[PDB]
Amino acid sequence: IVGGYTCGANTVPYQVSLNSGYHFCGGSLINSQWVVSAAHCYKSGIQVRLGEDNINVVEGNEQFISASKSIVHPSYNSNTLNNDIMLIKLKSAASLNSRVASISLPTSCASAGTQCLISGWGNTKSSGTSYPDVLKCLKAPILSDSSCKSAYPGQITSNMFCAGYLEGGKDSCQGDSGGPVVCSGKLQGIVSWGSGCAQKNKPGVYTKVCNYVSWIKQTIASN
Ligand SMILES: [Ca+2]
Numbered sequence: 001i002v003g004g005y006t007c008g009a010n011t012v013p014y015q016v017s018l019n020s021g022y023h024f025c026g027g028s029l030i031n032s033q034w035v036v037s038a039a040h041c042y043k044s045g046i047q048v049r050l051g052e053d054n055i056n057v058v059e060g061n062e063q064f065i066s067a068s069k070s071i072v073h074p075s076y077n078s079n080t081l082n083n084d085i086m087l088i089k090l091k092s093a094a095s096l097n098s099r100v101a102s103i104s105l106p107t108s109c110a111s112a113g114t115q116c117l118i119s120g121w122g123n124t125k126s127s128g129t130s131y132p133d134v135l136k137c138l139k140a141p142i143l144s145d146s147s148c149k150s151a152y153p154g155q156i157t158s159n160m161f162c163a164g165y166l167e168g169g170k171d172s173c174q175g176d177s178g179g180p181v182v183c184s185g186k187l188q189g190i191v192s193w194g195s196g197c198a199q200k201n202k203p204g205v206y207t208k209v210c211n212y213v214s215w216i217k218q219t220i221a222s223n
Contacts, residue, residue: 003170026179037178122175173197
């Protein structure tokens with residue numbers, strides 16, 4: 001997260017770290033057995049780490065659980081990043097408590113101007129690299145579709161939205177991918193792609209989760 005702030009331990013209780021011997025993507029817990037993340041975060045040998053704040057230190061409240069299956073959206077396109085969403089079923093159910101809790105799926109898409117909280121352990125520098133130990137947070141608004149399509153002409157499908165600041169300086173970045181964009185207590189976006197990080201006129205692009213709620217429900221129901 002570039003230009004964000006330290007969330008504070010366990011203030012984002014639905015945030016997941018996907019780990020393969022190191023943190024490579026975020027995710028969001030949506031019930032005790034399932035995580036939503038980005039399809040491009042797919043790999044085998046994923047351990048889902050719940051209740052994390054400092055990802056390099058065991059501090060208490062962590063639950064490490066293996067992924068028993070990861071379901072990339074059947075229509076995910078790696079060149080366009082359209083349908084960049086993946087569901088991970090956990091080998092066993094998480095213990096939900098204060099420190100670990102699920103986030104609700106939306107019933108409606110959020111409108112332009114809705115403020116949202118984006119969180120993750122990704123890079124904090126727009127030029128160079130600096131990975132944080134603790135979870136960073138950023139408040140960012142959903143931008144209008146015409147500003148989004150002006151910023152990224154020909155690349156925004158109906159399954160994507162822009163969120164962030166045209167002035168640059170605050171954004172999600174590498175390592176934040178697959179993590180949550182939560183607006184009004186509902187999971188509205190998944191960190192997907194952008195041009196650089198926190199560059200002027202190049203806001204972040206996010207998977208529009210409200211377009212996938214019946215696919216999520218039907219898939220969880222048959223697996
Ligand atoms: Ca830890």
